Amino acid sequence: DNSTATLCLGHHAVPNGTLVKTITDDQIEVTNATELVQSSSTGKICNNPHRILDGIDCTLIDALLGDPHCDVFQNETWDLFVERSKAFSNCYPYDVPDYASLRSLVASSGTLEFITEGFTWTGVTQNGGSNACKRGPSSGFFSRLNWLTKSGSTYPVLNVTMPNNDNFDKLYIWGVHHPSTNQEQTSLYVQASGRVTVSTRRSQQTIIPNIGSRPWVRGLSSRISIYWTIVKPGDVLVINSNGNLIAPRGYFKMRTGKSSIMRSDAPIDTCISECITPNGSIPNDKPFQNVNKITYGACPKYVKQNTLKLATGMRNVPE
C-alpha cells in the first residue's frame, strides 16, 4: 500500500463569452454580462401609471383658448399632454409673444379648468364671431375669449376690475387685435389707434395695436396677439382699453404638480410603464438609456453610448 493523490483547484469557463470594458483593458472576455443601456422601445405609450391626454389634432394652446374643434378638452387634466404632429389651428389667426412660456407654464399646471367671472363691459358689443372660426351652423370665436366691438358708434374707455378673493392663483388669458386696414380699425373700435393695459399691483403691461397686412391665414390679414397675466391671492386685475381688446371670460386654475407635455406620434396602449419617451414607453430596469433625452417619469439617465456591459462573472479563460 504505497501511493499518492492529486487534488486540482479551478474555476469554470464558457464556450461563448462576452467582451467587456475594464480599466486597463479596452476589450476583455468574461463569463457573462448585462446591458446597462436601454436602447429599444415598445413603440407606444402605456396609459399607466401616468394620466395621459392625447391632444389628437389640438395643441395645448388651441385647447386652452377654445378653438372650436378642441371643445372636447374643456376642463381637461393630464400628467402628460401629448401633442401630435398632425395638429391644426382652425380659429382666428393668432400669435403668442413667448409662445414657449405659455405652453410650458400651462403644461406644468396640468389643468384647463376655466372659471367664468361676471365681467361687465359698459357700452361695447360682445361675443364677436368670425367665419375663420366656425361653430356648428353659424360662425364663432375662441370659447375662452370675448371679442369686443363698439356700441352704436361709441367705444368708451374700458375700466374694469376683478380682485382675487380666493386662496389660489388665477391665470387670465387675454388678447389684442391687429386690424389689416385703417378702414377696419375704426369700424369695430371707433378710435383709429386702440390700446390695452392689463395690470396687477406688482406689475403691468400695455400693448398698442399695429394696423397693416399680414399674409392670408384662413382668408384673413388680421391677427390677434395672445397675452397672459397671473393674479396672486389678494391682488387685483385691472383692464384698460380705448380699443382693440379681446376680453377674457374668466380665469384658469393653476396647480403645482408633476405634469408636463411632450411632442410624439406614438399610439397609446393599455399597459403599465413608469417611463415615457417620445419613441414610446421604455422599461426602467436599467440605470442608463439611449432612446431619447426627452423623457417623463422615473426614467434611466440618457447617455451617449448605445451599449454598456457590466461583468456578472469572472474572467473567462478557455481550454
Partner 1 sequence: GLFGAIAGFIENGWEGMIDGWYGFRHQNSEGTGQAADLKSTQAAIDQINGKLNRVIEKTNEKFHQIEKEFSEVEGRIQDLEKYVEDTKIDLWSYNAELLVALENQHTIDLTDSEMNKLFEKTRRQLRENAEDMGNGCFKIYHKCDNACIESIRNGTYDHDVYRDEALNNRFQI
Ligand X SMILES: *[C@@H]1O[C@H](CO)[C@@H](O[C@@H]2O[C@H](CO)[C@@H](O)[C@H](O)[C@H]2NC(C)=O)[C@H](O)[C@H]1NC(C)=O
Ligand Y SMILES: *[C@@H]1O[C@H](CO[C@@H]2O[C@@H](C)[C@@H](O)[C@@H](O)[C@@H]2O)[C@@H](O[C@@H]2O[C@H](CO)[C@@H](O[C@@H]3O[C@H](CO[C@H]4O[C@H](CO)[C@@H](O)[C@H](O)[C@@H]4O[C@@H]4O[C@H](CO)[C@@H](O[C@@H]5O[C@H](CO)[C@H](O)[C@H](O)[C@H]5O)[C@H](O)[C@H]4NC(C)=O)[C@@H](O)[C@H](O[C@H]4O[C@H](CO)[C@@H](O)[C@H](O)[C@@H]4O[C@@H]4O[C@H](CO)[C@@H](O)[C@H](O)[C@H]4NC(C)=O)[C@@H]3O)[C@H](O)[C@H]2NC(C)=O)[C@H](O)[C@H]1NC(C)=O
Ligand Z SMILES: *[C@@H]1O[C@H](CO)[C@@H](O)[C@H](O)[C@H]1NC(C)=O
Ligand U SMILES: *[C@@H]1O[C@H](CO)[C@@H](O[C@@H]2O[C@H](CO)[C@@H](O[C@@H]3O[C@H](CO[C@H]4O[C@H](CO)[C@@H](O)[C@H](O)[C@@H]4O)[C@@H](O)[C@H](O)[C@@H]3O)[C@H](O)[C@H]2NC(C)=O)[C@H](O)[C@H]1NC(C)=O
Give the residue among 61, 76, 142, 82 at the shortest CA–CA distance from 112: 76
Residue at grid coordinates 403691468: 204
Residue placing its CB nearer to ligand Y in the complex, 164 or 273: 164
Q: Under the criterion CB under 6 A, does residue 291 sit at the interface with ligand U?
A: yes
Bridging pattern class, strands 45-48 and 301-302: unpaired
Report helix, strand or coil for 61: helix
Cα(45)–Cα(52) distance, rounded to whole angstroms?
Answer: 9
**Given the complex with ligand Y, which of 115 and 317 has the nearer CB atom?**
115
Q: Cell 375662441 belongs to which residue?
A: 142
120 residue type, one letter: T
Indicate whether 4 belongs to the interface with partner 1 (CB under 8 A). Answer: yes
Residue nearest to ligand Z (CB): 32
The site partner of 291 among partner 1, ligand Z, ligand U, none (C-beta below 5 to 8 Å per kind) is: ligand U
Per CB under 6 A, 313 contacts ligand Z? yes
Q: Whole-angstrom Cα distance, residue 147 to residue 129?
A: 7
Give residue 106's region: left, alpha or beta (phi > 0; psi -120 to 50).
Answer: alpha
Residue number with CB closer to a second copy (212 or 267):
212
CB of 119 to ligand Y, least distance (A): 8
Cβ contact 147:176 at 8 Å: no
Which range, of 39-47, 112-120, 155-163, 305-313, touches ligand Y by CB under 6 A? 112-120
Draw the binding track, 210-249, toward partner 1 (x: CB under 8 A; -: no contact). --------------------x-------------------
* Cβ(163)–Cβ(236) below 8 Å: yes
- In the complex, what is the shortest distance from the CB of residue 173 to a second copy, in angstroms, rounded to a whole number? 18
- Interface pick for ligand Y out of 22, 40, 75, 101 (rule CB under 6 A): 75
Identify residues 113-132 at the interface with ligand Y (CB under 6 A).
113-118
Window 101 to 140, contacts with ligand Z (CB under 6 A): none
Q: Which residue has the cell 397675452?
A: 227
282 to 311, contacts with partner 1 by CB under 8 A? 284-288, 293-305, 308-311
Ranges of H-type helices in 142-282: 182-189
Site for partner 1 in 85-124 (CB under 8 A): 98, 100-102, 104-105, 107-108
Of the listed pieces 108-116, 210-218, 288-296, 305-313, which binds ligand Y according to CB under 6 A?
108-116
Please say which residue, 32 or 47, places its beta carbon nearer to ligand Z. 32
As a whole number of angstroms, the distance between CA 63 and CA 75 comes to: 10
Question: Which residue in the shown chain puts its C-beta closest to ligand Y?
Answer: 118
Based on CB atoms, which residue is closest to ligand Z, 210 or 312?
312
Partner touching 32 among a second copy, ligand Z, ligand Y, none, CB below 5 to 8 Å by kind: ligand Z
Select 39 or 104, whichever has its Cβ closest to ligand U: 39
Buried b (16+ CB within 10 A) or exposed e, 97-115: eeeeebbeebbebbbbebe
The interface mask with partner 1, positions 168-197, x = CB under 8 A, is -x----------------------------
- Say if residues 313 and 17 touch (Cβ distance below 8 Å): no
What does the chain come to in residues?
319
Give start and end residues of each alpha helix (H) in 111-207.
182-189
Of 286, 244, 264, the C-alpha closest to 158 is 244
The contact set with ligand Z (CB under 6 A) reads 32, 312-313
The contact set with ligand U (CB under 6 A) reads 39-41, 279, 291-292
